[PDB]
């Protein structure tokens, strides 16, 4: 496949940056698209091969060296960097193939970092009265105050992740929107069947997993520093 | 720009079919494609084509060209939730060396759930003890409700939920607050239906 690290990232502006691509299916030509929100896709480097260094759009540098890997480089950072990065690469075709694209990295370089905070995650369990009417059970999860929008929010039912039966926001909410840096809300909704619910060997899990700072960052505040790290919460389910 | 897409946007419900338009003044040209990029994700090529073949097809996604009018269609066939996305044309070019690729702005879709049997109601969801929750659900699609800062209430979007085991869809729209706040509050009748099940 095609891999990209990290997927989210929050950075002070003078740091150095480098994004990680890397496909194992031993494509010859790679790119680099930085992507604004609703812009179009931006070639920004490629490579022809095992030595070869500039896209149509024009500080960042590429690098490749081994055939599996393309990483980028930012030396210094600035906040007119703040975009989506994505990686692709190119199949067997007659002498561009089919494009393959990594998931992309969400950059945002702010000049201070004071402002990150980490998410709170509740859980809240089904009514009784949905129950009886539906003969359904639907929880909903809530990660709020969370500063930047990195954020990855899952459901985990008795041990495995769940896709069926859930809901997420696709967009964040402002909690202070007439503020250009404000902290976020984010919801989710994961429906069972009534029964199942009513199980109380029944586990759910709401799990968010925020992207923050690292220990290497330097943090002055009062609070602990807000790191990249995993924020869940629970409920079991209740036998009426 | 030498790529141009139709419409801007559309919106459809499940099980239907829709038709995208695409037109370029590249020159000269090379070859064409579709990509399918889902929110926040990276894009996904669907079908490739050249002069040579007036027609692609990757599952219930059927492309078209035609290189003398220079235009592309792609026809989604019955449309699934997991359609929703933007629709990229992207047109090639020869080169010197090797290529150039023209992105147009993607048309947006959005698929919605087909709602047969509206249950529209309003649970309010037990405090966690750990601000309280209200859910608006079961209301069908054409329901529009969106975000709300007044004033210390919060409401989110409608999303749609897919139980696949029922073979059941759903949309759902959530309130809270930490104040006074109940959940008649939260969702007034504008916009609820007439008929909405209050406890």
């Known amino acids: ?240 | 720009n030498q790529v141009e897409q139709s419409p801007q946007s559309l919106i459809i419900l499940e099980g239907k079919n829709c038709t995208l338009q695409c037109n370029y003044t590249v020159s000269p040209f090379s070859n064409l494609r579709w990509y399918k990029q889902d929110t926040g994700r990276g894009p996904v090529s669907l079908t490739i084509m050249t002069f040579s073949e007036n027609t692609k097809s990757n599952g219930r996604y059927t492309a078209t060209l035609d290189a003398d009018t220079k235009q592309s269609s792609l026809h989604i066939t019955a449309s699934q939730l997991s359609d929703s996305a933007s629709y990229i044309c992207v047109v090639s070019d020869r080169g010197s060396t090797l290529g150039r690729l023209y992105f147009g702005r993607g048309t947006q879709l959005t698929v919605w759930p087909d709602i047969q049997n509206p249950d529209p109601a309003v649970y309010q969801l037990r405090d966690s003890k750990s601000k309280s929750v209200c859910l608006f659900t079961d209301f069908d699609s054409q329901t529009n409700v969106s975000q709300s800062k007044d004033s210390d209430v919060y409401i989110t979007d409608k999303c749609v939920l897919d139980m696949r085991s029922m073979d059941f869809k759903s949309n759902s729209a959530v309130a809270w607050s930490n104040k006074d706040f109940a959940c008649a509050n939260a969702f007034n009748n504008s916009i609820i239906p007439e008929d909405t099940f209050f406890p």
């Open chain 1, 1 to 240: 496949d095609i891999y990209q690290t990290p997927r989210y990232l929050v950075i002070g502006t003078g740091k150095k940056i480098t994004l990680e691509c890397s496909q194992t299916m031993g494509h010859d030509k790679m790119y680099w698209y930085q992507q604004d929100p609703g812009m179009e896709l931006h070639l920004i480097h490629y490579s022809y091969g095992v030595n070869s260094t500039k896209g149509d759009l024009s500080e960042s540098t590429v690098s490749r060296i081994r055939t599996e890997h393309f990483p980028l480089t930012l030396e210094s950072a600035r906040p007119s960097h703040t975009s989506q990065y994505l990686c692709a690469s190119s199949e067997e075709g007659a002498l561009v193939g089919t494009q393959y694209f990594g998931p992309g990295t969400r950059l945002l370089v702010l000049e201070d970092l004071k402002n990150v905070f980490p998410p709170e995650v509740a859980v809240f369990e089904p009514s009784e009265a949905e129950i009886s009417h539906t003969q359904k059970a639907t929880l909903v999860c809530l990660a709020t105050g969370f500063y930047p929008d990195h954020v990855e929010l899952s459901w985990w039912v008795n041990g495995k992740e769940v896709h069926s039966g859930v809901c997420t926001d696709p967009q964040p909410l402002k909690e202070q929107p007439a503020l250009n840096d404000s902290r976020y809300a984010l919801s989710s909704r994961l429906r069972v069947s009534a029964t199942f619910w009513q199980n109380p060997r029944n586990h759910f899990r709401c799990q968010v997993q925020f992207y923050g700072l690292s220990e290497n960052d330097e943090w002055t505040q009062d609070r602990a520093k807000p790191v990249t790290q995993i924020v869940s919460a629970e409920a079991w389910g209740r036998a009426d």
